[model samples]
Target chain A: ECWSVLEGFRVTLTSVIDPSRITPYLRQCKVLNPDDEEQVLSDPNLVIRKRKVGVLLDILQRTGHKGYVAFLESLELYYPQLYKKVTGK
Target chain B: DYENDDECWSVLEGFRVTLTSVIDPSRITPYLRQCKVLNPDDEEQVLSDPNLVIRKRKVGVLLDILQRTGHKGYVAFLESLELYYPQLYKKVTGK
Candidate 1:
């Protein structure tokens, strides 16, 4: 019976970021159903992407950091969703 | 309530059937890896994560520990579930 369930599915464990920092992200991943599109939209990926960009822009507006601005610009190219959300577009 | 929780954890602790015993290790490893990726640090944060990753990791770790320690009680728990909750086990393991 157990063997039958083993027919199709894969599991893996890898460290993409510091485990401690990643815990919050993992917690969000667990509840997500990869098969569900609506759930995917509400994923932590979206939330984190938005939050990080928001923080950086606020910092940029207050005290410009050329290195940070360049990094954020690069991020805009890499993470459009975050840029759009932070820029209110 | 204290006794009940302890009993539950104890039963769960001993329930270490190998991934190979119940499912293919290859199939199970991805989910386990995802769980680990989702929660890299084995921290108390799991209590608050409210995600499937944490639950999956908890279960995966329990099974791994049970297999490594040869927890007889855990094996017995699985057997008991197989005997009494065959359908549920089947649904969970997709057997």
Candidate 2:
């Protein structure tokens, strides 16, 4: 089933995600390509961390099913609490 | 909600010349992208223009996109203005 759980909690994910730590693993998962990684890392506006994190989530939303699983894996590795919350596991 | 959207559109339309003239697409494109109002292809199209005149015209297209796309775009457009064009933001917002 195509669960759109991530879509529902976008604002929540944006608040808690540490892009730098999470992105490396997402890169390894092939969800975030080189330019996507650069955009995620080099977001110029740092005053609003949610905005920065929002960029990452936005990119992932475009990455299709593989991206969702990759995001789960990364979340499990670096943000187990978030993973638990998102997965309800 | 649509009244708010129309009002936002009206503000942007009223200040079209000022906004297109001053906004550097490079600065606000990220915000638009983050907001999900401006997709990658649209951002690339806006940024690839060769000169200021053309780029400003592209900004006009962005204004069109912002107004027509979704309700969230109004908020994104204002945030972009607030970040990069504070004076314009104040004027457009009547703040």
Candidate 3:
């Protein structure tokens, strides 16, 4: 009901997106270090990185909440753990 | 709303209680780099003193200075403070 708080936000995001879109979007993007492309390819902290969080804060940082609905489309079926640790929720 | 002699004392007390809460006047330095206010830095310098009476008369004196800023400005300052405390914001604006 009140999906705006914490995990409520995460669940809504997990449901609507297609894992296919996010897998490539995350892999293709560079978030970590000098040689992040070859190095910490798995570190989610520097990530686009809750999977880089909600996809929302990372997306929010760049998109300013406009494509919010569309952005969640990239979070689905990706690494949900990344999402969990990203928000620390 | 005219005034009489001791007639305003209760009103004065209520105003003090209200102002002290609004400007918690913490020790941290953000926009306040230790001005006419005390540096909240040393809790040992203030809160570490266990006298509730002394603490009450402590920063509770902001009402003394705010009286100089006029009424509407203080009211508006209080309204803007809601963003920092979310539960209060939700209560007041219901969003």
Candidate 4:
């Protein structure tokens, strides 16, 4: 499925994505609620934080294209490599 | 990682008051957040209160968060203490 695109990058994204950089923006974008933002932003452990990032991707997947686009915009701003890779551009 | 270490936990639990007393919720909440032990909700709950017994209560809430969250939380907790409250961290870790 096309949804697999984000899922396919899950491992790499979890490892490299800095949630602190984009979580607040994602919340501002309405992709993440207060609680969702809290859940995503609250961990200090690398391993656990990566898990939370995975959860964020899962949420974005369920949130559909609006979230997907917001995430892409976030990547375009903060994660150019990821944005480029995901967009294949 | 350090969570299952009974000795570490005992020291942590035994020093509960010291931990709460020495820790500045406002300061450490960020570390806890980075550590993934304290969520924004939990940090707000601890920090947004009126302050007083509530201050202690808020710090206690932090303690509860670290305790309930598991070993990694403890690891983060120790690391926070080590970085911000080194003497206390030494007391707690005894090394």
Can you tell me the DockQ of model 3? 0.01
Candidate 4 deviant stretches above 4 angstroms: A1-44, B1-95
Per-residue error (Å), model 1, residue A89: 51
Candidate 3 structure quality by residue, lDDT tens digits, B38-94: 233321122221333332332123222223345532443234334333444354344
Report the lDDT tens digits of candidate 2 across residue range B1-95. 43242232332234334333333334454554554555666554443433344334334434343344344555554455465456655655558
Q: Mind giving the per-residue lDDT tens digits that candidate 1 earns over A9-67? A: 22322111122232233334342123221222222433333333333233323332332
- List model 3 lDDT by residue over A1-89, tens digit each: 12112222233223332222222222333221223212212222222222212221222223323333222223222334433432244
Native contact fraction, candidates in order: 0.00, 0.00, 0.00, 0.00
Tell me each candidate's TM-score: 0.22, 0.27, 0.20, 0.28
lDDT of 2 by residue, A22-67 (tens): 3334445444456654544332323233333444444444554433
lDDT of 1: 0.32
* Candidate 4: CAPRI quality band: incorrect
Task: Kindly report the docking quality category of candidate 2.
Answer: incorrect
Poorly placed runs, candidate 2 (over 4 Å): A1-89, B1-3, B50-95
Model 2, chain A: how large is the TM-score? Answer: 0.47
Weakest lDDT window of 10 consecutive positions for candidate 2 chain B: B3-12
Whole-structure CA lDDT of model 4? 0.43
